[PDB]
Amino acid sequence: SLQFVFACISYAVGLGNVWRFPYLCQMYGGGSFLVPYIIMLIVEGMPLLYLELAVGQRMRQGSIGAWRTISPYLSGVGVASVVVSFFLSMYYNVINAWAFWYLFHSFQDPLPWSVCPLNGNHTGYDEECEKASSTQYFWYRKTLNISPSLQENGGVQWEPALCLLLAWLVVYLCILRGTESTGKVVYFTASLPYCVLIIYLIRGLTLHGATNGLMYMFTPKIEQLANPKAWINAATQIFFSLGLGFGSLIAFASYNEPSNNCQKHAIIVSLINSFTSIFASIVTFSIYGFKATFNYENCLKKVSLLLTNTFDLEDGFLTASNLEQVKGYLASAYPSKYSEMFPQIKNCSLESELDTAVQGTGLAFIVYTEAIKNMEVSQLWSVLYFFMLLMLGIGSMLGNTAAILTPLTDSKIISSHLPKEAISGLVCLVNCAIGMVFTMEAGNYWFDIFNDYAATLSLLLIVLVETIAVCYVYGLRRFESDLKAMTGRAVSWYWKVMWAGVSPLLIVSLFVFYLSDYILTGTLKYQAWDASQGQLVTKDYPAYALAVIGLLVASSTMCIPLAALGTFVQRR
Amino acid sequence: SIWLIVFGVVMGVIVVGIVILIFTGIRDR
Ligand SMILES: *[C@@H]1O[C@H](CO)[C@@H](O)[C@H](O)[C@H]1NC(C)=O
Ligand SMILES: *[C@@H]1O[C@H](CO)[C@@H](O)[C@H](O)[C@H]1NC(C)=O
């Protein structure tokens, strides 16, 4: 019935493609990132998703069991599929914390991101809140309290820490309570995000200067199309959104009937995920284009007002549509006065604003708060959207934590030493203790590090290992014969070609290009808030942050080879 | 402080729910 299709939708719609995708799309030039993603969907999404589902269905085991049955000296990869998930559980729930925060500041008539606080004389606005938008000031100062540079970090902020603790308690409560009731929840926890995004698209397309954002998002600029970072980010994002590498897909496929259809399931899941991500990006970039157009209008208005006040002009004589000509006339009238303010005049254009209006790990929150503050009944829409985002985050965290606990649940030694219900509490406590780092003054920088590198190389390496093992280790012909015996209609030559030498080759080529780019540039830099300019400035990563990122990647990458060496020694 | 009051209420509700769930689990023991 339609319940199965709704369950597939719920598995496909998650916090990943709704929150992470718009920020990546804006970072990498919009269309110049959207084109690879689709290309990275028909090549790496559907084939690898179907391979994972088929492996899970055929093996009738968990992730560790499935990757141990195929080959002994490869079973360590099953441990790796845990480690990455662990790191995800380290930081992903932090997102929910922010949601909680942004929910709790939604029951006030003067919304905290609606009106800028006064300087103190009760006559003007804060310099940071004047240079930056109200939403950006609320996000970067009253929510994260971010420090200008990663080198200087303060103590653990108590309010974000409390929000994170609340998020972890909610996750633990959901773990203890729900195990099989989701069948009812799927009737409601799967269609609400689509309704919310429909409402926000309705609002966004009614805003002035909204189509500029869509035109920017769908424009594939060839200048930035050749950036390897865009391809690598698209690949890691599609792998993170589909759930590849985490091992949850294999665990879910192990619980389904041997005659259950998988090709249709994989294609439907992949296409639904891509379409949902595209729709969310459309809405977010409509709102972002509205913000950029509003900033452009504001800058033109400020320049026009300044020129009118310094040249004794009429209130309406100088407009945006006839600016430069008038300036030229002033250049012909008396350049002595014109040069007195020539450095003061600013050159503002739509392209530059669209490139740098809003950016960072919190593009979704800033953009949607901007959209909410331009509504009719702001509080209701804010509550609905943040509840939807919190529900998506809780569902994704439930899936990830179940994938983490399942190998630990299967541990006979662990189960006989501690109660099964206490392992979840211990995991939640440890994850909260580790994730308390992201609540410092510079915690957002660490969150950015763990959003860029805790899932980039690890997922790609795990997927490459899986496709190599199912490609040549077990034998593609044997796998096809087993699948044909299980269900018939043996794999079409498209799937066999994709699994044989297309996906591994493409992933290896992307990795080589990324490594070469990093080696040649050698300038891995992060964005940092600058209150004086009220913008984002690129700054070089310090040594210790690079060491932390390298260690985080290296543990996940070396989880497999170390266990392979251990198994080889055990054999020898 | 609207947000602090709402956070306190939500935390109390979550604490009560977790306490009753753990009590039921202990009963399962
Ligand atoms: C606020 O008052 C102080 C008093 O010294 C003054 O220095 C400051 O310029 C005032 N603010 C503005 C925006 O003029
Ligand atoms: C604006 O354009 C003029 C024209 O060359 C240039 O001299 C100036 O540096 C640019 N920027 C500003 C802030 O005026």
Whole-angstrom distance, CA of residue A429 vs CA of residue A548: 22
* Cα of A415 vs its chain's centroid, Å: 35
CA separation, residue A10 to residues A184, A262, A450, A480 (Å): 12, 17, 25, 29
Crossing angle of the two packed helices A63-70 and A41-59, in degrees rounded to 10: 90
Q: Tell me, what DSSP letter sits at residue A526?
A: E
Tell me the two tokens of residue B18. Answer: 């977790």
Protein residue closest via CA to atom 13 of ligand 1? A124
∠ CA A498-A477-A62, nearest 5°, is 80
Whole-angstrom distance, CA of residue A349 vs CA of residue B17: 54
Protein residue closest via CA to atom 4 of ligand 1? A121
Q: Is the distance from CB of A369 to CB of A135 less than 8 angstroms?
A: yes
A1 lines ligand 1 (CB under 6 A): no
Query: Which sign does the torsion angle of CA A69, A73, A77, A78 carry?
Result: positive
How many Å lie between the centroid of ligand 2 and the Cα of residue A521?
29
From the list A409, A433, A407, the residue with the least C-alpha distance to A420 is A409
b/e sequence A24-42, b meaning 16+ C-beta within 10 Å? bbbbbbbbbbbbbbeebbe
Q: Is the distance from CB of A319 to CB of A385 less than 8 angstroms?
A: no
Residues in contact with A286: Cβ distance below 8 Å, sequence separation at least 6, in sequence order: A201, A204, A205, A207, A210, A211, A213, A214
Residues in contact with A46: Cβ distance below 8 Å, sequence separation at least 6, in sequence order: A266, A267, A270, A271, A498
Q: Return the residue in A173, A387, A424, A432 with the most chain B beta carbons within 10 A, the one to mutate for interface testing.
A: A173
Tell me the two tokens of residue A527. Answer: 């964005």
| A332 Cα to chain B: minimum distance (Å) | 58
Q: Is the distance from CB of A499 to CB of A263 less than 8 angstroms?
A: no
Domain boundaries of chain B, sorted by first residue: 1-29
Atom of ligand 2 at shortest range from CA of A345? 14
Whole-angstrom distance, CA of residue A308 vs CA of residue B24: 74
From the list A386, A353, A422, the residue with the least C-alpha distance to A209 is A353
Would you tell me which residues 1-29 of chain B have a C-beta closer than 8 angstroms to some C-beta of chain A? 2-4, 6-7, 10-11, 14-15, 17-18, 21-22, 25, 29
> Does A107 reach chain B within 8 Å, measured CB to CB?
yes
Resolution in A: 3.8
A345 lines ligand 2 (CB under 6 A): yes
Return the CATH architecture of domain A2-571: Orthogonal Bundle (1.10)
Helices (H), A145-258: 158-177, 182-185, 192-205, 211-217, 222-225, 228-242, 248-254
Q: Which residue among B6, B15, B29 sits closest to A104, beta carbon to beta carbon?
A: B6
Q: Is the distance from CB of A172 to CB of A425 less than 8 angstroms?
A: yes
Q: Is the distance from CB of A345 to CB of A306 less than 8 angstroms?
A: yes
Tell me the two tokens of residue B23. Answer: 């009590």
Considering only CA atoms, give the Rg of chain A.
26
Strands A525-530 and A535-540: antiparallel
- Of all residues in chain A, the one with the smallest CA distance to B25 is A421
CA separation, residue A129 to residues A125, A136, A531 (Å): 7, 8, 9
Look at phi and psi of residue A243 and say left if phi exceeds 0, alpha if psi is from -120 to 50, else beta. left
Domain boundaries of chain A, sorted by first residue: 2-571
Q: Which of A302, A303, A347, A352 to mutate to test the pocket of ligand 2 (most atoms within 8 A of CB)?
A: A347
Whole-angstrom distance, CA of residue A498 vs CA of residue A503: 6
How many Å lie between the centroid of ligand 1 and the Cα of residue A126?
12
Atom of ligand 2 at shortest range from CA of A347? 1
Whole-angstrom distance, CA of residue A389 vs CA of residue B20: 27
Whole-angstrom distance, CA of residue A474 vs CA of residue A59: 12
Whole-angstrom distance, CA of residue A218 vs CA of residue B17: 47
From the list A141, A101, A134, the residue with the least C-alpha distance to A115 is A134
Q: Tell me, what DSSP letter sits at residue A162?
A: H
> Does A98 reach chain B within 8 Å, measured CB to CB?
no
Whole-angstrom distance, CA of residue A475 vs CA of residue A499: 11
Q: Within chain A, what is the greatest distance between any pair of CA atoms?
A: 91
Protein residue closest via CA to atom 9 of ligand 2? A343
From the list A453, A363, A367, the residue with the least C-alpha distance to A26 is A363
Whole-angstrom distance, CA of residue A113 vs CA of residue A372: 10
Is the Cβ pair A100, B11 closer than 8 Å?
no
* Cα of A562 vs its chain's centroid, Å: 30
Crossing angle of the two packed helices A31-39 and A228-242, in degrees rounded to 10: 60
